Design an enzyme around this catalytic site. Sequence first.
Site, short mmCIF file in Angstrom:
data_model
loop_
_atom_site.label_atom_id
_atom_site.label_comp_id
_atom_site.label_asym_id
_atom_site.label_seq_id
_atom_site.Cartn_x
_atom_site.Cartn_y
_atom_site.Cartn_z
CD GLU A 198 -2.90 1.25 0.23
OE1 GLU A 198 -3.81 0.40 0.23
OE2 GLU A 198 -2.79 2.11 -0.67
CG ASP A 255 -3.59 -3.18 2.58
OD1 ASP A 255 -3.63 -2.32 1.67
OD2 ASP A 255 -4.60 -3.59 3.19
CE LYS A 309 -10.62 -5.17 2.30
NZ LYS A 309 -10.27 -4.51 3.58
C1 LIG Z 1 -11.40 1.22 -5.04
O1 LIG Z 1 -11.15 1.80 -3.80
C2 LIG Z 1 -10.14 2.78 -3.78
C3 LIG Z 1 -8.86 2.46 -3.34
C4 LIG Z 1 -7.86 3.42 -3.32
C5 LIG Z 1 -6.46 3.07 -2.84
C6 LIG Z 1 -6.48 2.10 -1.67
N1 LIG Z 1 -6.27 0.75 -2.16
C7 LIG Z 1 -6.85 -0.44 -1.56
O2 LIG Z 1 -6.61 -1.48 -2.06
C8 LIG Z 1 -7.76 -0.38 -0.33
N2 LIG Z 1 -8.88 0.53 -0.31
C9 LIG Z 1 -9.76 0.58 0.88
C10 LIG Z 1 -10.93 1.53 0.90
C11 LIG Z 1 -12.06 1.21 0.18
F1 LIG Z 1 -12.09 0.03 -0.54
C12 LIG Z 1 -13.14 2.08 0.19
C13 LIG Z 1 -13.06 3.26 0.93
C14 LIG Z 1 -11.92 3.57 1.65
C15 LIG Z 1 -10.84 2.70 1.63
F2 LIG Z 1 -9.69 2.96 2.33
N3 LIG Z 1 -9.52 -0.27 2.06
C16 LIG Z 1 -8.41 -1.18 2.05
O3 LIG Z 1 -8.22 -1.86 2.99
C17 LIG Z 1 -7.52 -1.25 0.85
O4 LIG Z 1 -6.44 -2.13 0.86
C18 LIG Z 1 -8.15 4.72 -3.72
C19 LIG Z 1 -9.42 5.05 -4.15
C20 LIG Z 1 -10.42 4.08 -4.18
O5 LIG Z 1 -11.70 4.42 -4.61
MN LIG Z 2 -6.48 -2.68 3.04
MN LIG Z 3 -4.84 -1.74 -0.13
#
Ligand SMILES: COc1cc(CCNC(=O)c2[nH]c(-c3c(F)cccc3F)nc(=O)c2O)ccc1O
Ligand SMILES: [Mn+2]
Ligand SMILES: [Mn+2]
Length: 179
Positions: free
Chosen positions: A64, A92, A118
Amino acid sequence: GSHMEDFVRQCFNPMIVELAEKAMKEYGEDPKIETNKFAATCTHLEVCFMYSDGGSKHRFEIIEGRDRIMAWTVVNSICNTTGVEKPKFLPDLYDYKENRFIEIGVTRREVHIYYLEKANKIKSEKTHIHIFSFTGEEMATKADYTLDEESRARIKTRLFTIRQEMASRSLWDSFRQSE
Ligand SMILES: COc1cc(CCNC(=O)c2[nH]c(-c3c(F)cccc3F)nc(=O)c2O)ccc1O
Ligand SMILES: [Mn+2]
Ligand SMILES: [Mn+2]
């Protein structure tokens, strides 16, 4: 700007804010408008970093916080080095000690609900899942919480501090009823 955005900027360190902006802009979203998701991305970033900060020096590979393309390159290298199956969704972290990818979740609901959401998406049972909540609960695959209690307790404490500051600004309700 908005009040959530000013609070995010005074709550998280500048570097985490910059990474959250890049992460959102890479996926077409704007932190100046999607302010609740801005706070969530920042929060998820900080947890990921305290997590890797727990344990030994070379223990984790931080996935991440990189741009999508570079993260998949490191993930590819890890799989071609250890033999672990390539996950379907970008995780992550990678645990060099446990030889498994880690998906870190941060939730405003019951950790029970999030982990199910998840584990259903991942399907690749090799990827470890570790969920933290803003109320201090945690839940991890096989009840294997990877880190020591003290490193996890710091994450739980920080999460409740963010909850209190948002509430003091009357932002917590909108943040909660937004996941
Ligand atoms: C498609 O979602 C988005 C992801 C990102 C970058 C983060 N990349 C991840 O993979 C990720 N995202 C989330 C997450 C979510 F799924 C919804 C709302 C808030 C969050 F933090 N939780 C995690 O645990 C995790 O690993 C940027 C913009 C996006 O719209
Ligand atoms: Mn995550
Ligand atoms: Mn992530």
